[PDB]
């Protein structure tokens, strides 16, 4: 039902970017350009 | 109302800063009828007897005491400056300037932690402490 | 997908029923070697057959209504309000998500070029470990 | 949930001391920080057995919703009971408008099937009790937007 | 035999994965209105 | 027994030793369960006329007055001023509602007159009980004023009688007047455990309260074994003390954030100071994350 | 001559009357003079109407999806908890005033429908758990395991939660004193302790969350596991 | 505790009383760290010329508490043993 | 003082009395309290009773003279309950103490001398 709901897929990337934006403004208050996904998506054992 | 005490000239302010040897002189520079200063004085009143073991809170009207307007750059509605043993304690809040607070925080625990940080870094001797929060973003979600 | 989950649960608990009656015919117990192809499969997972507490969980009736009503007792919001790990098993598996994620971000060493790992001069990353909240104050987790 | 009625309904299915406990457990003081009130009407919903009280009171209201005849057709005979959406016979299935019924915790889902006669007799009984000269039934009609 | 004198060793053993040890499927009046 | 006792009571109230007092008190606390006998008889005999007044009026004297009020005729739940002296308007409303639908047959004339004389002797027992109560409270406030003020004059007369008078009640300790009137219902309880002032509190607040009422009334008993405080000021003061303790049982800034001077001495006490809470932990593979490997299933956390 | 001592005290009287309004408790200061009392009452009514309105307005703001911070939601949730409990106390007192809302013939209709169902099902009623009940240790282990599952450790539980953990591990130690205590509670305990309430703030709606005293939680959890086991055993709940 | 020097034959055998663990109310969470702290207190008792720099544990569940209790002595080496030596035979001789 | 407190020990006798009551507290021969003095008078194990003249009201121990005449036990009133309470090894005021008989205890000569001395006071 997620793959069928396009409103939920839009909301899912909106909330994912919201979580990533809170991580990024916890890093630096200036919102970056081209922030690497590697710091978010790396597993916790490998540091991410 | 504002049961916090008031400095009505430059002598009352400078001797109120020089009065304390082991407590942070927290001074609000603003007008009691301002809404920003009214909320900031509500926050300072709700913690005035919490932090009484390591701080003192004074209110200062800008119209009544205008001599600190140029030196302390009191050009915002409320400013909250922190002093300890005559030294002006600056705080890297993240707002861009470190000298004053210059807005009204609504969390009284954040004001308790800012005063507690100023106390810990000032008895250690720093003129600049780092706030235990970053106030550059308003953290609204 | 849920449709795939239900047809594989139907056909896999059918296979368990035939394997169970042929293992009662052979007087033995169903081991891990049969039911290894059925493993992360079934809506009660086949995993749940091999639990120590399983007999105890045969007396936990009404547990799904209980997990729904945990929202009026526990302030922590449960995202798995609908299931329990004990009774249904783990109805997902993201181990290959983690492997394909490591491979997509560039491999382990393609990840570690974004890090201070080569500044640590560890000759390889294999024998290493973190210290989760050890710090400089020895964590001091417990203090006033 | 009337706790007198809930007490009497529970005394049917459980021990009378168990039912007296479950009802007296719902007639307690509910307390926030400074404020507290005696909960005498409803159930407290975060008792551990409130899951049982809700499903049993919901069963009672399913007997109100289905009737004893259709609830007995849906549950089957007590000797060989039916599973969820199954009847003994397809004639037992088609013997009522209510084909399917699923009560969740508090949500009911009732699937009906009508003929033209059954539907227009039900519509005529409704429009006898709640007449609609304006075709004013389309307005408050919830849809799935 | 008496065998008087026997060591004990208190250990924090028995850590496992909470599945079965040997990997087996171990299986073992009415109301009336008048 | 009622004639032998209460004609002496009538002779003593018309004059306005203590064996008549204790016998009157024992009589009236037997009157209450004799009234329970009469009430259960009336409940069994009237329920063919009205099988619902037991659940609606469970109070025994109100039930007796409302089935002496009604009888066969449940017409007298309508506009009844006489029933308004007995029950609340809520109770009158609900007995009128269930007298509209009674499912009860009428009585006989012999059955109605039998129930009538049963209710009449029940009111005779109730008025006799209250007459005994008024006499025993008057004569016990004259005989032992302070004890009557503390406990209540009926229980004061009971514990004065089973102890054997005031001058035997004084020279008893406080630990025996608690168990005075004792005998599987509650153990180590006396007449002053089943007092109204000791039951005026939660059930776990009870036993200790007995020791509070047993001691102070003992003082009161000693205080009125000699004939001082005839007005009862010692009883008033001690009773204020009793319910003051009953109400007593019933229902700072932040420190300046200095750091420690520090722990500069070690071992001894300090290893126990950490063995309480910050003790010898695993210190290996419990504080670690194991950089390369994934040891669990991947995102279980 | 009097306002140089009295003024701080009347501010504490203002804040105390407001705290007593927020708590649904009586505020009558006997030594306070009734014009000052009437002005504090007036202040409390004005702040009450503003407070109710700003709680409902901030709730429509939060529920609509407008961007708020942590202290606005925390403050809002406290305001709505006190307002929802004022409404709930008014609901309970309306039940005590307006009688049982279900009529006597309505109640016996519901009841006879239930007895005709349970006679139709040949339902044998769930008995009291016997003394050497075969599964009472199984249901007790499931009950205490379920109560333990309610604790994920941030590592900091309060006095009552770690006291609950102590009572659970004590019932793990001697399960039969626990089962005897539970059956004693199920037989005789009819007066209980205050159930704490708070509200899980989902932003669409407030979910009530109840903290029961842990001895009562253990008795309730065993009763829950027992009744659900026996009702599944007796097929009380039909498959719908 | 049998603390046997191979080279000097000086066996430091510590007597552990019955009253140390008859009424201790503890698990092996006292036991491992207790035998480790007492052999560390032996190490702290002796002078630095007589302290060892290599300690061999027979039973493998003791080198991990010995790592913790000997952080005052990082100069010493705590290895396990693949060869176990029967020092219960010392218990079996009547003198010891 | 209270005129019903009779006999009343003078200063030398009450010094000997409080030292004997202190020694009996040490020798575990002492029962503090008016109810415990009433008990050990009823059991007949009391050597002698001391009481406190500054007990208000006095009559909460004035049953104890009558018990000391029905048990043949010497009784005497100390000046104040605070000194008697401290002489029993408690900081609270104690208004009535019972020095009791024990199995051949070493205070029996002091207790006999104080008995002979405080039966001279009631005269």
Q: Which pair of tokens denotes residue F189?
A: 């309880």
I122: domain CATH number is 3.30.1330.30
Residue of I nearest to F215 (CA): I35
The residues with which C37 forms a beta bridge, in sequence order, are: none
User: How many whole angstroms separate alpha carbon I101 and alpha carbon I48?
Assistant: 9
B58: domain CATH number is 3.40.30.10
**At I17, which helix (H) or strand (E)?**
helix I11-26
User: How many whole angstroms separate alpha carbon D9 and alpha carbon G118?
Assistant: 11
Q: Cα dist. B46→B51, B75, G25, G81, I15 in Å?
A: 10, 25, 23, 22, 60
Alpha helix stretches (DSSP H) within chain G: 3-22, 34-64, 70-97, 104-120, 136-149, 159-173, 175-188, 214-233
Cis-peptide, bond into residue C36, ω within 30° of zero: no
Closest alpha carbon to F163 in F175, F173, F177, F183: F177
Closest alpha carbon to I73 in I38, I31, I106, I109: I38
**Residue I1 sits in which domain range?**
1-123
End-to-end CA distance of chain E: 73
Residue of E nearest to H30 (CA): E10
DSSP calls for E1-34: -----------------SB-SSS-----------
**Tally of CB atoms within 10 A around I112:** 12
CA angle A31, A35, A38 (to 5 degrees): 140
Q: Which pair of tokens denotes residue C138?
A: 């020895």
User: How many whole angstroms separate alpha carbon F256 and alpha carbon B54?
Assistant: 5
DSSP calls for D86-101: --SSHHHHSSSSEEEE
Experimental approach was cryo-EM
* H14 secondary structure, DSSP code: -
Residue pair I21/I114 in contact (Cβ under 8 Å)? The answer is no
Question: Is B141 among the domain residues?
Answer: no
Query: Which chains does B contact via 3+ CB–CB distances below 8 A?
Result: A, F, G
End-to-end CA distance of chain B: 34
CA angle B1, B7, B12 (to 5 degrees): 155
Cis-peptide, bond into residue C112, ω within 30° of zero: no
Number of domains in chain I: 1
Question: Is B23 among the domain residues?
Answer: yes
User: How many whole angstroms separate alpha carbon D144 and alpha carbon B65?
Assistant: 64
Number of domains in chain B: 1
Cβ contacts (< 8 Å) between G126 and chain D: which residues? 13-15, 18
The residues with which G200 forms a beta bridge, in sequence order, are: G207
Could you tell me which residues come within 8 angstroms of residue E16 by beta carbon, excluding any fewer than 6 positions away?
none
Could you tell me which residues come within 8 angstroms of residue G84 by beta carbon, excluding any fewer than 6 positions away?
G199, G206
User: How many whole angstroms separate alpha carbon G236 and alpha carbon D52?
Assistant: 10
Cβ contacts (< 8 Å) between G210 and chain D: which residues? 30, 44-47
Q: Is the CB of residue D94 less than 8 Å away from at least one CB of chain G?
A: no
**Residue B78 sits in which domain range?**
2-136
Q: Cα dist. F188→F175, F181, F184 in Å?
A: 10, 10, 12
Question: Is B81 among the domain residues?
Answer: yes
CA atoms in the 13 A half-sphere facing the CB of D39: 27
Q: State the Rg of chain F over Cα.
A: 33
Nearest-CA distance C83 → chain E (Å): 19
Q: Is the CB of residue H27 less than 8 Å away from at least one CB of chain F?
A: no
Does C touch G (3+ CB pairs < 8 Å)?
yes
Question: Is B75 among the domain residues?
Answer: yes
User: How many whole angstroms separate alpha carbon H42 and alpha carbon H26?
Assistant: 23
Do residue F254 and residue B22 have CB atoms under 8 angstroms apart?
Answer: no
Residue of C nearest to A39 (CA): C114
Q: Which pair of tokens denotes residue D28?
A: 């307690």
Residue pair I68/I113 in contact (Cβ under 8 Å)? The answer is no
Residue of H nearest to E6 (CA): H88
User: How many whole angstroms separate alpha carbon F79 and alpha carbon F95?
Assistant: 13
Query: Which chains does F contact via 3+ CB–CB distances below 8 A?
Result: A, B, C, H, I
User: How many whole angstroms separate alpha carbon H74 and alpha carbon H78?
Assistant: 10
Do residue D28 and residue G89 have CB atoms under 8 angstroms apart?
Answer: no
Interface of G with B in 37-96 (CB under 8 A): 67-72
Query: HEC profile for C36-99?
Result: CCCCCCCCCCHHHHHEHHHCHHHHCCCHHHHHHHHHHCCCCCCCCCCCCHHHHCCCCCCHHHHH
Q: Cα dist. I38→F92, F213, G125, I115 in Å?
A: 58, 18, 60, 18
Could you tell me which residues come within 8 angstroms of residue G27 by beta carbon, excluding any fewer than 6 positions away?
G16, G17, G20, G21, G44
Q: Is the CB of residue I43 less than 8 Å away from at least one CB of chain F?
A: no
Q: What is the resolution of this structure in A?
A: 3.3
User: How many whole angstroms separate alpha carbon B135 and alpha carbon F17?
Assistant: 90
Q: Which pair of tokens denotes residue B9?
A: 């000239």
User: How many whole angstroms separate alpha carbon G233 and alpha carbon C23?
Assistant: 27
* Sign of torsion over alpha carbons G230, G235, G237, G240: positive
Residue of C nearest to E27 (CA): C55
Q: Is the CB of residue C82 less than 8 Å away from at least one CB of chain D?
A: no
Residue of A nearest to B137 (CA): A29
Do residue D15 and residue G125 have CB atoms under 8 angstroms apart?
Answer: yes
Q: Is the CB of residue B53 less than 8 Å away from at least one CB of chain F?
A: yes
User: How many whole angstroms separate alpha carbon F177 and alpha carbon F162?
Assistant: 10
Chain pair D-G, CB pairs under 8 angstroms: 188
Could you tell me which residues come within 8 angstroms of residue G4 by beta carbon, excluding any fewer than 6 positions away?
none
**Tally of CB atoms within 10 A around F242:** 20
Do residue F253 and residue B53 have CB atoms under 8 angstroms apart?
Answer: yes
DSSP calls for chain A: -TTT-HHHHHHHHHHHHHHHHHHHHHH-SSPPSS--THHHHS-GGGT-
Residue pair C58/G228 in contact (Cβ under 8 Å)? The answer is no
Do residue H64 and residue F280 have CB atoms under 8 angstroms apart?
Answer: no
Do residue B106 and residue G71 have CB atoms under 8 angstroms apart?
Answer: yes
């Amino acid at each position: 039902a997620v793959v069928n709901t396009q409103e939920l897929l839009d909301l899912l990337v909106k909330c994912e970017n919201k979580i990533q934006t809170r991580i990024k403004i916890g890093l630096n208050s200036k919102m970056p350009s081209r922030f690497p996904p590697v710091v978010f998506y790396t597993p916790k054992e490998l540091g991410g | 109302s504002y049961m916090l005490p008031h400095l009505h000239n430059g002598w009352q302010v400078d001797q109120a800063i020089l009065s304390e040897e082991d407590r942070v002189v927290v001074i609000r520079f603003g007008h009691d009828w301002d809404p920003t200063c009214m909320k900031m004085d509500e926050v300072l009143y709700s913690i005035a007897e919490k932090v009484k073991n390591f701080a003192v809170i004074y209110l200062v009207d800008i119209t009544e005491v205008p001599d600190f307007n140029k030196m302390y750059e009191l050009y915002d509605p409320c400013t909250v400056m922190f002093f300890f043993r005559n030294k002006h304690i600056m705080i890297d809040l993240g707002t861009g300037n470190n000298n004053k607070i210059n807005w009204a925080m609504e969390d009284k625990q954040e004001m308790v932690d800012i005063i507690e940080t100023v106390y810990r870094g000032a008895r250690k001797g720093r003129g600049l402490v780092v706030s235990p929060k970053d106030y550059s973003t308003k953290y609204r979600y | 997908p849920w449709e795939s989950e239900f047809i594989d649960s139907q056909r896999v608990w059918a296979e368990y029923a035939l394997k169970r009656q042929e293992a009662i015919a052979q007087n033995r117990r169903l081991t891990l070697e049969d039911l290894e192809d059925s493993w992360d499969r079934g809506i009660p997972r086949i995993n749940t057959l091999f639990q120590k507490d399983r007999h105890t969980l045969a007396y936990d009736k009404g547990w799904r209504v209980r997990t729904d009503f945990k929202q009026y007792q526990v302030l922590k919001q449960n995202p798995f309000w609908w299931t329990h790990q004990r009774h249904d098993g783990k109805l997902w598996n993201l181990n290959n998500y983690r492997t394909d994620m490591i491979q997509a971000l560039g491999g382990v060493e393609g990840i570690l070029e974004h890090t201070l790992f080569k500044g640590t001069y560890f000759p390889t990353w294999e024998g290493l470990f973190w210290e989760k909240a050890s710090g400089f104050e020895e964590s001091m987790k417990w203090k006033k | 949930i009337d706790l007198t009625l809930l007490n009497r309904l529970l005394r049917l299915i459980v021990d009378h001391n168990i039912a007296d406990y479950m009802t007296a457990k719902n007639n307690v003081v509910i307390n926030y920080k400074d404020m507290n009130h005696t909960n005498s009407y409803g159930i407290i919903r975060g008792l551990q057995f409130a899951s049982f009280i809700v499903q049993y009171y919901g069963l009672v209201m399913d007997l109100l919703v289905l009737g004893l005849h259709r609830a007995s057709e849906m549950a089957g005979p007590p000797q060989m009971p039916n599973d969820f959406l199954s009847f003994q016979d397809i004639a037992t299935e088609a013997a009522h408008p209510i084909r399917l019924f699923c009560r969740y915790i508090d949500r009911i889902h009732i699937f009906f099937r009508f003929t033209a006669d059954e539907a227009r007799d039900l519509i005529q009984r409704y429009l006898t009790e709640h007449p609609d000269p304006n075709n004013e039934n389309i307005v408050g009609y919830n849809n799935k937007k | 035999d008496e065998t008087y004198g026997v060591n004990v060793q208190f250990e924090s053993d028995e850590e496992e994965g909470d599945e079965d040890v040997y990997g087996e499927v171990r299986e073992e009046c009415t109301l009336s209105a008048n | 027994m009622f004639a032998e006792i209460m004609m002496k009571i009538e002779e003593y109230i018309s004059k306005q030793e203590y064996r008549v007092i204790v016998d009157a008190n024992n009589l009236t606390v037997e009157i209450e369960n004799e009234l329970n006998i009469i009430h259960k008889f009336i409940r069994d005999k009237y329920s063919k006329r009205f099988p619902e007044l037991e659940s609606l009026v469970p109070n025994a004297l109100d039930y007796i007055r409302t089935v002496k009020e009604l009888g066969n005729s449940l017409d007298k739940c309508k506009n009844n001023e006489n029933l308004q002296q007995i029950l609340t308007n809520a109770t009158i409303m609900v007995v009128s509602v269930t007298a509209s639908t009674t499912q009860g047959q009428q009585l006989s004339e012999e059955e109605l007159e039998r129930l009538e004389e049963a209710c009449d002797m029940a009111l005779e027992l109730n008025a006799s009980k209250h007459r005994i109560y008024e006499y025993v409270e008057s004569r016990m406030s004259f005989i032992a004023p302070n004890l009557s003020i503390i406990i209540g004059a009926s229980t004061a007369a009971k514990i004065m009688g089973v102890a054997g008078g005031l001058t035997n009640l004084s020279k008893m300790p406080a630990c025996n007047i608690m168990l005075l009137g004792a005998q599987s219902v509650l153990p180590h309880t006396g007449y002053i455990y089943h007092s109204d002032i000791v039951q005026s509190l939660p059930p776990d607040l009870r036993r200790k309260a007995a020791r509070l009422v047993a001691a102070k009334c003992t003082l009161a008993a000693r205080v009125d074994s000699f004939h001082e405080s005839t007005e009862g000021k010692v009883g008033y003061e001690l009773k204020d003390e009793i319910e003051r303790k009953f109400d007593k049982w019933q229902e700072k800034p932040l420190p300046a954030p200095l750091d420690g001077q520090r722990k500069k001495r070690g071992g001894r006490r300090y290893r126990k100071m950490k063995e309480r809470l910050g003790l010898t932990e695993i210190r290996k593979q419990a504080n670690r994350m194991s950089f390369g490997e994934i040891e669990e299933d991947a995102y279980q956390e | 001559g009097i306002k140089q001592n009295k003024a701080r005290t009347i501010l504490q009287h203002l804040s105390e009357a407001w705290r007593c309004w927020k708590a649904n408790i009586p505020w009558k200061v006997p030594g306070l003079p009734t014009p000052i009392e009437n002005m504090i009452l007036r202040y409390v009514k004005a702040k009450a109407d503003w407070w109710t309105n700003t709680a409902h307005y901030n709730r429509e703001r939060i529920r609509r999806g407008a961007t708020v911070d942590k202290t606005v939601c925390k403050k809002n949730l406290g305001r709505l908890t006190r307002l929802y409990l004022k409404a709930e106390q008014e609901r309970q007192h309306n039940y005590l005033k307006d009688g049982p809302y279900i009529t006597a013939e309505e109640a016996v209709a519901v009841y006879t429908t239930t007895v005709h169902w349970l006679e139709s099902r040949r339902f044998s009623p769930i008995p009291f758990p016997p003394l050497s009940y075969k599964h009472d240790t199984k249901l007790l282990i499931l009950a205490l395991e379920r109560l333990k599952e309610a604790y994920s450790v941030k590592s900091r539980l309060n006095q009552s939660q770690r006291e609950e953990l102590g009572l659970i591990e004590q019932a793990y130690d001697n399960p039969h004193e626990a089962l005897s205590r539970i059956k004693r509670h199920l037989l005789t305990q009819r007066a209980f302790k205050e159930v704490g309430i708070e509200f899980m703030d989902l932003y669409s709606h407030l979910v009530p969350v109840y903290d029961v005293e842990p001895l009562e939680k253990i008795t309730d959890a065993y009763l829950d596991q027992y009744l659900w086991y026996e009702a599944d055993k007796r097929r009380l709940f039909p498959p719908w | 505790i049998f603390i046997f020097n191979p080279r000097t034959g000086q066996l430091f055998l510590k007597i552990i009383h019955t009253s140390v663990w008859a009424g201790q109310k503890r698990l092996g969470q006292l036991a491992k760290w207790k035998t480790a702290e007492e052999v560390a207190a032996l190490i702290r008792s002796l002078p630095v010329e007589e302290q060892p720099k290599q300690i061999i544990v027979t039973r493998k569940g003791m080198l991990d508490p010995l790592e913790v209790h000997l952080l005052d002595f990082p100069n010493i080496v705590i290895k396990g043993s693949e060869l176990q030596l029967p020092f219960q035979a010392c218990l079996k001789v009547e003198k010891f | 003082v209270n005129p019903k407190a009779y006999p009343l020990a003078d200063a030398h006798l009450t010094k000997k009395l409080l030292d004997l009551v202190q020694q009996s507290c040490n020798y575990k021969q002492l029962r503090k309290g008016a109810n415990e003095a009433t008990k050990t008078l009823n059991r007949g194990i009391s050597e002698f009773i001391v009481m406190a003249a500054d007990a208000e009201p006095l009559e909460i121990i004035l049953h104890l003279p009558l018990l000391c005449e029905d048990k043949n036990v010497p009784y005497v009133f100390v000046r104040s309950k605070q000194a008697l309470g401290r002489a029993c090894g408690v900081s609270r005021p104690v208004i009535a103490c019972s020095v009791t008989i024990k199995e051949g205890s070493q205070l029996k000569q002091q207790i006999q001398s104080i008995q002979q001395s405080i039966e001279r006071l009631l005269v």
